[PDB]
Amino acid sequence: MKVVTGKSIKEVDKNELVNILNAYKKVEVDLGTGDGRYVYKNAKENSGTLFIGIEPIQKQLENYSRKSQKENITNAIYILGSVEYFPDELLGTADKLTIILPWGSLLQSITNPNYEKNSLISNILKSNGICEIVLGYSQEYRLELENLSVEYLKSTVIPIFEKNNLHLTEFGSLGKKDLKPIESTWSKKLSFNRPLYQLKFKKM
């Protein structure tokens, strides 16, 4: 697989990756982070966990992979990948998988899901792994979560994800304390109720 460090990429094979994974008690794979900020911020806060960001365009991960290397944040690693070109080396490695949608074709449609494609989620995870999905960024925001009722939860939300081998364990709103790892608070953005949601699952 191809590891990003600034303007450069370098091949790391499975044998080398195994030596890296084995040094940590927890491994987390992070998809959809935009520029890898989430990987850097969480690595700095949890030195015992290895955080792995995967994005398809090398320039996406240039800034934070360089920051991580310069600041000796050795538990943050950044890898080229996508649904269509996913690194086999990372299958079965994650104690936690966090998906900040969108990430390409992953979970792209609620009405015609590519189940063969979405099976990546369970196959990244270890058997007792946890998946966290942050919803609200996709252009479709579709799931109507603003005024969640037990009927909609049981008849719509839970079945959509059980069809991808995910059993829902937690649902809730994101707060500004939780946005900070994902997004800069102060960077220039469009002005505009813009809610974001966090859903956690275990394997079925």
Side-chain angles (χ1 to χ4, degrees), residues 12-69 71-115 117-138:
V12 177
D13 69 1
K14 177 72 180 206
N15 194 257
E16 181 175 0
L17 176 59
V18 163
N19 294 329
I20 294 173
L21 302 172
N22 285 351
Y24 299 90
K25 293 303 162 283
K26 300 180 178 75
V27 175
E28 175 169 328
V29 171
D30 295 310
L31 312 181
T33 66
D35 57 0
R37 171 191 174 91
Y38 189 83
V39 173
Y40 166 87
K41 293 286 187 174
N42 275 107
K44 283 172 62 83
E45 294 302 294
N46 309 270
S47 68
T49 297
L50 177 65
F51 296 85
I52 307 179
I54 310 175
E55 299 294 329
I57 296 167
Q58 176 195 8
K59 280 181 169 185
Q60 286 182 251
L61 302 180
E62 163 179 346
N63 176 35
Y64 273 102
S65 56
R66 179 194 299 115
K67 273 183 66 78
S68 303
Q69 183 226 60
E71 290 160 47
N72 211 44
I73 310 298
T74 47
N75 59 325
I77 190 182
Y78 304 84
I79 298 172
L80 286 186
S82 71
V83 168
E84 293 70 32
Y85 295 96
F86 191 87
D88 278 336
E89 297 97 333
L90 290 176
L91 297 175
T93 67
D95 299 290
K96 185 185 183 181
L97 174 61
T98 298
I99 306 171
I100 307 169
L101 286 178
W103 194 66
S105 57
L106 189 58
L107 296 169
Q108 190 157 226
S109 164
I110 90 122
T111 181
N112 199 28
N114 194 320
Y115 291 117
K117 272 197 190 311
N118 294 336
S119 78
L120 173 68
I121 294 172
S122 216
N123 283 12
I124 292 169
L125 283 169
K126 299 186 170 183
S127 58
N128 207 18
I130 295 316
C131 177
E132 177 179 331
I133 299 184
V134 174
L135 289 180
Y137 286 100
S138 295

